[PDB]
Amino acid sequence: LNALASLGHKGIKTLRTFGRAGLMLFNALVGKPEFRKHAPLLVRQLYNVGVLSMLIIVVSGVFIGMVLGLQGYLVLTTYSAETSLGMLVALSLLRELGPVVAALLFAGRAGSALTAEIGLMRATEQLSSMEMMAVDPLRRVISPRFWAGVISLPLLTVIFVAVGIWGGSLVGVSWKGIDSGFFWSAMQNAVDWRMDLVNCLIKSVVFAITVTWISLFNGYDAIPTSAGISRATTRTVVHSSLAVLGLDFVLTALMFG
Amino acid sequence: LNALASLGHKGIKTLRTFGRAGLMLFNALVGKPEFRKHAPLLVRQLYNVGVLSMLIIVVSGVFIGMVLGLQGYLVLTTYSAETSLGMLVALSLLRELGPVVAALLFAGRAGSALTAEIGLMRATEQLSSMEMMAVDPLRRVISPRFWAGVISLPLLTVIFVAVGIWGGSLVGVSWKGIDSGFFWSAMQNAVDWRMDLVNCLIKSVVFAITVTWISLFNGYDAIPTSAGISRATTRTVVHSSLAVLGLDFVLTALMFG
Amino acid sequence: KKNEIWVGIFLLAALLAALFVCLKAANTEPTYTLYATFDNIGGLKARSPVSIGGVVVGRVADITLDPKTYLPRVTLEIEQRYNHIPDTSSLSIRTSGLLGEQYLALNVGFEDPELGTAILKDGDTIQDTKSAMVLEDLIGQFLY
Amino acid sequence: KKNEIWVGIFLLAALLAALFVCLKAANTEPTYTLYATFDNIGGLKARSPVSIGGVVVGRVADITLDPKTYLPRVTLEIEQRYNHIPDTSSLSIRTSGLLGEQYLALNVGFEDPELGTAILKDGDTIQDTKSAMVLEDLIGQFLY
Amino acid sequence: KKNEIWVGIFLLAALLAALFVCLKAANTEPTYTLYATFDNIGGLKARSPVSIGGVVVGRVADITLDPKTYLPRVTLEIEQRYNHIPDTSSLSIRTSGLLGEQYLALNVGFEDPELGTAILKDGDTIQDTKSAMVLEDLIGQFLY
Amino acid sequence: KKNEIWVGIFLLAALLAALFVCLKAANTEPTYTLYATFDNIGGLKARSPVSIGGVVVGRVADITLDPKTYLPRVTLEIEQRYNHIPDTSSLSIRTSGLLGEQYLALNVGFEDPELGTAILKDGDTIQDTKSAMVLEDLIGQFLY
């Protein structure tokens, strides 16, 4: 009974949750178009999701590029190998630390702010009065928030990389006196356009669809009580950033193995 | 006029915000004690803040320990220096990547969940009906949430480190076949108890007081409207994790320079 | 409802198929195994490759020691295509580079096969080996 | 309006940062293929640089082994701009420094011939090779 | 409940069927102690290996120094899978690595023994031990 | 009791993990100071080890150069447990491997006297030293 049925009870309830989240997105994207009422609304959500998150990625992009330059130099300088520091900074970022750490910092700021907003909008009766005015809430609220999230992440990755590469080029070339020509020339013929640059672009788009979907669904199907929204915000950061670290292992076994 | 007075207007308003946040904490902590009504409430908030955040730190602790083992091995193995891999994994974590990356993942999950909760509690009239029942909201809501946040971070750091060190000991010793004795013996006499272990404990406590204070204040003095809580949640993750990366540079110039 | 079950099955079946065709397209050996008895295999491992010339013809499988006379024994794995190797060939333990991996080099020993050479098959022996070098015996030979 | 300027900067700051990666961090002609049989390639993998003088003129396509002779044949791939290479030329596998990877180094033949020289083209075979070296038998000659 | 039975049956089975199947494709030991007395242990420390040829058979637990003679005294821990080693065996500190870390190679005293030479047991002493070498004296021998 | 149990696992797994860091990467006795005058210390820092045979007995404290007769003077700090050192002993500055650190080396005396020599104690000047070797005159020896 209890070990047998209650695991059947509590696993079927997950099969409704996957079905409630799929039916939400099909009714949000696949719709009757409007290109001069959603396009002013896309500029607002491209500002809210992206632009306010641009300060946290610039400042935390320089830092993680620096500590791979500091701790990368001190362990390499005994063998007189500091002219291969750029092959460590600009390959940790372009392969793994770029698409992943810029995803966990996106699911934190933008992932919680979308779930705590549509959750509180549902509790302060602004989704019941909007749908009782012949205005679709899945086309007004969810639809310009999905497209502004699948756009803001692959652009925030290349700002995280290009200051991380420059951040390692500040303690390499300038602070610790590695040569200005041997540093960059050893980085250039180790980075290929197909294996290291496009395969970072493919990683960011898959993480953008994943993070934005879980962030809007947990803020739509949330209990509107006090702790209902506080444990839908926790449910966003954990579930959508385990699917980053779960999909990254699958993708890094396919694109680099 | 406009360039002169409006920067005086909008800078004085920050001097009230620093004063509103200081007066909040003095009235929350400094109070008339109660050790059998706050102690059952501390166990709830130690569960909500800490235990639900323990899965995101374990899984993301193994990953960042692995990529410093993968990209640390491939750049070191040409000089036959792979027996000094542990001095790179267990010194990136114990010095910088431990107290900082486990702080940005704390300000994401626990930092937003505290601000989106006390914000929505204020908007659904549960802080006005609590203070009109001779029950102090700064001693019931803020006070067991501050002490359960200054405790859950220095314990979540040493779980982030001890799986990051083990994560680099999985691709070092087991997967890439570095020797089981030369790996650990080169890590042991490079880690000192005063410079690398206590100075990681001091870093985590300072980040715990900083993150928890900003997370409760932005969820107390928030506008209770729809976008008032969504831009107090954004204001939490940006401001409290710039004070991580701002205090880290000051502390790493004092404890390691 | 009934819409929320036929979609949740279809969304889980689509995702699990997409991962289990991605892992199968990201992750078989027509070989035969030989053995050899060395003296010093210093630096070899359980996966170091065996090679003719410089091209890889297989991979060492086991490194199990012989516990009667304490000489280390290896269990090679030569792929099926390079069958006709004489019984009298060679072996060696060389270093790929100057400091690299110790790869177990080969040498197809053909001198002038008039009368007939034995050809190795599943589970034979190599009787001619050449153990690795050690830095102390070289300095012991140079500085004395 | 104030959130339209800040989107117009955000699309520019990602355009200026995708231009720094593609230029400061990363700086396909028709090619004709040639064949050669060494005796011992050192560490030549696939897509390893061929060089005349020190500038790279091509890579190595295939590395596969000879059946019933077991001597390695390489498959070079040189661009169709250096068409006038004389077939008195010689290859020699050289390392790149002291701990470098490996490369192949072509030397053209200068003779000023009067008997009708040669021309290398598609499907030709560059003989007159030189195999790589091995550090085990460098010190073996150094000792005795 | 019969409808809520198989949803928990096949889920908890295939989460535990994958648990055993990921267990087998992933995957301490009784040892015994020995002693020695060297003169110059260079970079030898605790946990440095003890290898009979090329296969690791032990570690070094403690490396403490004797009083009133001031010669070091290592404490090996050879695995109990190997016990046939005669008392006439030798020990020598070789040199792996490049920063100065050192291991112990164990040349056995296999001389086809003439009386049943004493096999080692818990807490005995190997007396034929060649101490490690330092390159600050090899250069001194080389160039006065 | 789902809350009160899962908090107890949190204060346990943060102690199982803090034991891991402290027992893996961490595996104060009274001393007595000794002095020695050199000619050229190579790379002797502060808190650089002293070794009798290869076991560390103490560290270097100060590195001060003597005015008016410029020759570097070290300030050793040897633990007050190895008190039985005779005053005929030597020092030498060595290094661990090739690419290592300049540590030190203390060599005790075996000369079995009868006249009665001395013993080392707090504040004593160890003469009969030997300064570090410089690279640029080693190549000056080998070439001239």
CA–CA separation, F130 vs F90, rounded Å? Answer: 8
Closest CA to A65 of A159, A152, A132, A2: A159
Half-sphere exposure of B50 (CA within 13 A, CB side): 33
DSSP state of C31: E
Interface test with B, best of C98, C99, C135 (most B CBs within 10 A): C99
Token pair listed for A122: 């549902």
- B242 neighbourhood in chain A, CB within 8 Å: 55-56, 59
Report helix, strand and coil shares of chain F as percent, to nearest 5. Answer: 20, 25, 50
Sign of CA dihedral A203, A208, A209, A211: positive
CA–CA separation, C8 vs C18, rounded Å? Answer: 15
Chain E residues with CB-CB distance to B under 8 A?
Answer: 45-49, 59, 96-99, 101
- A17 neighbourhood in chain C, CB within 8 Å: 8
Q: How close, in Å, is residue C99 to chain B by CA atoms?
A: 6
Beta bridge partners of F35: F75, F125
- Is F34 within 8 Å of F74 (Cβ atoms)? no
Token pair listed for B121: 């509690």
User: How distant, in Å, are the alpha carbons of A149, A228, B94, C62 from that of B113?
Assistant: 21, 11, 27, 54
Sign of CA dihedral B175, B178, B184, B186: negative
CA–CA separation, C12 vs A19, rounded Å? Answer: 9
- C133 neighbourhood in chain D, CB within 8 Å: 136, 139
Token pair listed for F30: 């009274």
Please judge whether C7 and A23 are an interchain contact, meaning their C-beta atoms are less than 8 angstroms apart: yes
Q: How close, in Å, is residue C3 to chain B by CA atoms?
A: 32
User: How distant, in Å, are the alpha carbons of B50, B101, B191, D60 from that of B197?
Assistant: 22, 17, 8, 51
Q: How close, in Å, is residue A226 to chain B by CA atoms?
A: 6
Interior/surface letters E31-56, b for 16+ CB within 10 angstroms, e for the rest: bbbbebbbebbbbbbbbbbbbbbbbe
Say how many C-beta atoms besides its own lie within 10 A of residue A64's C-beta.
Answer: 27
Q: How close, in Å, is residue E104 to chain F by CA atoms?
A: 15
Of F7, F21, F25, the CB nearest to B51: F7
**With breaks defined as C to next N over 2.5 Å, after which residues does chain A break?**
none
Count the residues in chain C. 144
**Which residues lie below 8 Å from residue D59, measured CB to CB, with a gap of 6+?**
D46, D47, D48, D49, D50, D76, D77
B33 and chain C in contact, CB less than 8 A: no
- A95 neighbourhood in chain B, CB within 8 Å: 71
Please judge whether F99 and E95 are an interchain contact, meaning their C-beta atoms are less than 8 angstroms apart: no
Of D4, D11, D25, the CB nearest to A165: D25
Interface size between A and E, measured as CB pairs under 8 A: 36
What experimental approach yielded this model? Answer: cryo-EM
Interior/surface letters E110-130, b for 16+ CB within 10 angstroms, e for the rest: eeeeeeeeeebeeeeebeebe
Please judge whether A159 and D21 are an interchain contact, meaning their C-beta atoms are less than 8 angstroms apart: no
Strand ranges inside F67-118, DSSP E: 73-79, 90-92, 105-107
Element (H, E) at C56: strand C55-56
| R_g of chain E, CA atoms, integer Å | 24
User: How distant, in Å, are the alpha carbons of B236, C135, C136, D80, E46 from that of C119?
Assistant: 75, 36, 38, 45, 48
Beta bridge partners of C56: C51
Token pair listed for E21: 């199947």
Interface test with C, best of A12, A14, A15, A214 (most C CBs within 10 A): A15
Indicate the residue type of E116: G
Question: What strands lie across the sheet with C102-105, from one edge to the other?
Answer: C55-56, C50-52, C102-105, C94-95
A44 and chain C in contact, CB less than 8 A: no
Closest CA to D57 of D36, D88, D85, D21: D85
Please judge whether B177 and C99 are an interchain contact, meaning their C-beta atoms are less than 8 angstroms apart: no
Closest CA to A221 of A42, A2, A81, A13: A13
Of E47, E96, E98, the CB nearest to B185: E47
| R_g of chain A, CA atoms, integer Å | 22
Interface test with B, best of A216, A233, A236 (most B CBs within 10 A): A233
Q: What is the 3-state secondary structure (H, E, C) of A108-170?
A: HHHHHHHHHHHHHHHHCCCCHHHHCCCCCHHHHCCHHHHHHHHHHHHHHHHHHHHHHHHHHHH
Q: How close, in Å, is residue F133 to chain B by CA atoms?
A: 25
**Which residues lie below 8 Å from residue B53, measured CB to CB, with a gap of 6+?**
A234, A238, B105, B106, B109, B110, B152, B156
CA–CA separation, E53 vs C61, rounded Å? Answer: 18
Secondary structure class of A24 (helix, strand, coil): helix
A233 and chain B in contact, CB less than 8 A: yes
- C27 neighbourhood in chain A, CB within 8 Å: 253
